[PDB]
Amino acid sequence: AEAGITGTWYNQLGSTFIVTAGADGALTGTYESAVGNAESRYVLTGRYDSAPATDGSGTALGWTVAWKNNYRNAHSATTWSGQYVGGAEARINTQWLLTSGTTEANAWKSTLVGHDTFTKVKP
Amino acid sequence: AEAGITGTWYNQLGSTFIVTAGADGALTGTYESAVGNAESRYVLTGRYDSAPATDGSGTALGWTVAWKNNYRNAHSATTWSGQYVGGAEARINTQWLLTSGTTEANAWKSTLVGHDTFTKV
Amino acid sequence: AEAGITGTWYNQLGSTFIVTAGADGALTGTYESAVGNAESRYVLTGRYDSAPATDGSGTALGWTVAWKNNYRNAHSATTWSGQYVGGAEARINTQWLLTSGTTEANAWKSTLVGHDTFTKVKP
């Protein structure tokens, strides 16, 4: 549902995710990370299932943040893949992949994987 | 390098990725998978890091595809995270996460992980 | 530390992990999963850093369970990679990969990824 996803969310590290879900399945917003070589806000773009199932299934969605803005350029990008589960305590549970740009030689260790849980605060 | 991300790419499964990379870091285009609960094209959106480093590093990027279009709704979304490397033979090396929308009971097994390599051949 | 890892542990799904850490960095035991095409106990084998660092760093370790025993054969195997963090509330935080045996054609979707947190109960 777009309304349910739209809002301000935070995760366990203390990062901020501000998103708007558009009618066509699009997600746009900004992300502020509490950790890493990151400062200020970054632009994020993603997609979500605008037509989930009836039932108590989560809504699959994903988004990307390239870690470059006017203040910093970390030469990396993160993609979060997960599902939104609404209710009185709406959560977005995800797993993410953080890839850094590297030389052909260190490419084997260019990607980090983790998981984040976001709790909604505002629309 | 970077702008050269624009084009038509294909991966080892035969899927087609058509992207336009905008000067400021955006990625837009369509994706058509050769496998899965999918038919036709799906819209994709992503970001790439528009000012890569001397050093001969690749350009980090990622994009998402929600597997819903006017033909099918597979109730899942895939994100690809990787890097672009240009040169005579340019490729985009990625690892992806495909999450399906499940009930809680099946949440533990909602995500598949894989890797795709794209070239313009 | 072997003593700290040795014991009975459970995770958020309600699965049981019984392990013994040997002096040489080896881990042996049994695993009982609360979910999946799994029944009874399965044998597990792994390795851990028998010489972690001083400091408050976790001990890296990993183990594998092939999901076949005398009662069931799910044609799959899971590997858990994570770190043991001791203290009064010792935990083992992990990320896992569950690969199923498939045809060359469905190989693209042979692996599931997730994360489990284990809480210790007994030695």
Place this chain on the structure above:
Amino acid sequence: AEAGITGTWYNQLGSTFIVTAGADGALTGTYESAVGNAESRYVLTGRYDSAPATDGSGTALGWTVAWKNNYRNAHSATTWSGQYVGGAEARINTQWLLTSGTTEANAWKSTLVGHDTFTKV
């Protein structure tokens, strides 16, 4: 097929994996990586699923290597999860997780993920 997992395998990075597959599902041997904070051989232990299915499916298996030996202690461990496919050209296709022991502050970035393909060539 299965028993044929025993042997010396090499991956695209040039690492060498020497394994012995026991009749009841065990995997034992040594690993020597061509990259990283590693030198010489490390002990590995794993499991494979000893009764694979007609159907022409691969044999699921996984193994672990703690990067500590009498030369180095990199305070990390890697697990490879994948499947073995035999035939004229046999390979083991895997995805791995490399976890380092961090302080809590760095726990979020303690795990790398990759994929390796091994052959006996």
